[PDB]
């Protein structure tokens, strides 16, 4: 009966609808939910460390009226195993959040905890980023249902990844922009277009940059780690052919001037510090969500 | 008042070793019903070598006090080495309320607890692990009641932190205490006198015996440990073969009581010590031993910050 | 506008008092004022570690009611992955205030220029400007008014320390010698920057290797260890420079009788200060150490307020 947020489908399209209005209502009333109050305690644990992956989650669960017992990279599964190590986090915190890398370590962490267990970052998955973007276009453009989202750059790594799930959870109609070897892995591929058969959305993979940003409202990149990139930069040329009204969404840090310019990224159009400030809201409303149903 | 410290399972006397298991009883039931941090006050958990199952019992049980920990992992300068231990401690005495040290020679606890002007926690050391040993006893009484007059089997190593806290703090509490390891791995004859001591107060005994079948007979209580720290890595031993007659299997545990409980200072090598059917079988308490550690450091801090 | 505490000039006179003031009320009730209740957070960023300044900032965030956010060297350098400028934007969504230990000064006017919440130096290689509010508020409580007493530091003229007890100690109207050898003298745009304000304050810069002449007459005796970390490989000898400028008993014997010591720990016992003059009547560096946890939450408080 204890749920997980491991990947982006891990919530129906019902259930994400549910945690990106939480993450609204605790936007404008930050310490209104406090169902960590005692304080009880959340693990938040780095294979290898994300500094803005531990400001968001630290601050949020504080915000919640608990205590972050943040353990750095300086691992999970050297002294004992996952399940032991697991059945006594259980004990001492409510939910367990975990940035490592293969997808197993965090499938296997949560068949045994009885708390929440939420991927804060892996190698194939960033969701948390995801629903902080998807707050980040609903604020700015109303409804998510119909848009047309576009990734440019790398399509293997786990913002593609997550942003075809996220994406057509929510309706939004996704085109990842990529070079040939860098496409997306073909079981996520999958899911996505299955998911997107439920939600009305679609799902698009081209190596054509300008006609991925032709009619988008959402434009999105990520670094890029390097010749096989350049086509894809968002750019202001790529930019004037999207929607009116389009919004450029970047997961920092970003590399100005390689998968970005600062004209982009410093214009308009840029939603980029909206973006990272909504990781404490969306984080805050997934653990809200998670713990009252677990 | 005299500030109180509580470096080894002994500096506890047996009544005042029973108002704390009793205390950890009450805030398991009521873990934020004390709040004697109220602030937030601070308390230093410090570590020269690290320890992540102390830093959560200890983080989260300050916190719930209403304290702040303030943690120091051994990133940081090692306790002696930029100044000295004397002039630490005086500064730390200004900014927290108890010192929470995980180190290795007792000599610096000592030290360390002979200037501090606030109460001095061993949070794990070399020769004693008075913390998990309250957890151990908080977690016997629960399953088992009163502790006087039970009996008790360590199993492996007996000269390790956790063969001298069962000793020590077992008999304390009216344990009767046996250690079963083998010749050349006995407990150091120092703690061996002092259990022998408390025991006479209390009505409790101590047992050393390399005879594991012996030692399994009849006990309500099992416990193990690894064979081997970190440091002992390197010291030259084959630290498998002397210890395997003393593992705690199937075999062993069908020889004590029907209703013998095990008990394990985690991490386990499951395979060495202890099995895999041992371990997650019924008999098994080492999970509630575990979540133990929380409420018996949270009453030991209550009780060491009232009387100091 | 929005108040940095950069260096300890960043603080008129007048202001100056009003955050020593608000450390001797925090002293007597430390938990009464909560601007970052919620919890509000505070980020704590080192560039390279200090366990002295993150204990005395991350109970002194908590105390004020905030949650301060540490992060230690180990996480990319800023600077390294991205401009300082954009790390400054995104701190700005997340805390109510930054606290940066870093080394040049550049780096920290970098920060403060472009954030829009109060930038504060927790120790960098030009200037210690928390340690000296500490320092002065230590002072204070042993003598009183600060205004004319006679403060001299002795050891390496130009690191943190010396500037920032120029610069402190004028804005209190402290008149300040710095006695120091030959090529470790403080930095001259510092030393102006003191000798402008202490007209302000009729206080005095002087600099001097008369280690006799600066201890006689002196309220306040300070020093500092002799090296830091980042100079035990600049090829120096940093030891017999400074043996003619240890605080000892005998130098101590020529201040006034009722003078006091200071040292922002950790000493060196034997080098820079011996253990007679450590832990006789004078000293008052374990006063000094606790004021740490007060000045530097005033401060805070202080800030938060007028930004
Ligand atoms: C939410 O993330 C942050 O606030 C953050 C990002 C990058 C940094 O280098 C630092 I320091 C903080
Ligand atoms: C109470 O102890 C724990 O919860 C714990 C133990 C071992 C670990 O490696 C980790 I991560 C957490
Ligand atoms: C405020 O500074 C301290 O309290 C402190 C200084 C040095 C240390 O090694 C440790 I542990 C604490």
Redesign the interface.
Known sequence: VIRHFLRDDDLSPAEQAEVLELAAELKKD??SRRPLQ??R?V?VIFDK?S??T???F??GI??LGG?A?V??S?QLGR???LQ?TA???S???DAIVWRTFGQERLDAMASVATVPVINALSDEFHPCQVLADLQTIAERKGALRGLRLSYFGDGANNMAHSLLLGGVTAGIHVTVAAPEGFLPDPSVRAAAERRAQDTGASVTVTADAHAAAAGADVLVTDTWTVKPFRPFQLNSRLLALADSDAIVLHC???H?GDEITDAVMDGPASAV?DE??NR?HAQKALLVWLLERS
């Open positions: 930050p310490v005692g304080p305690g693990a460390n500094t803005r531990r400001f968001s630290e601050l504080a915000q205590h017992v353990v750095d300086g002294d004992e195993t032991d059945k006594v986090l004990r001492y915190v920092l840090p970003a100005r510090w990272a400030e404490l």
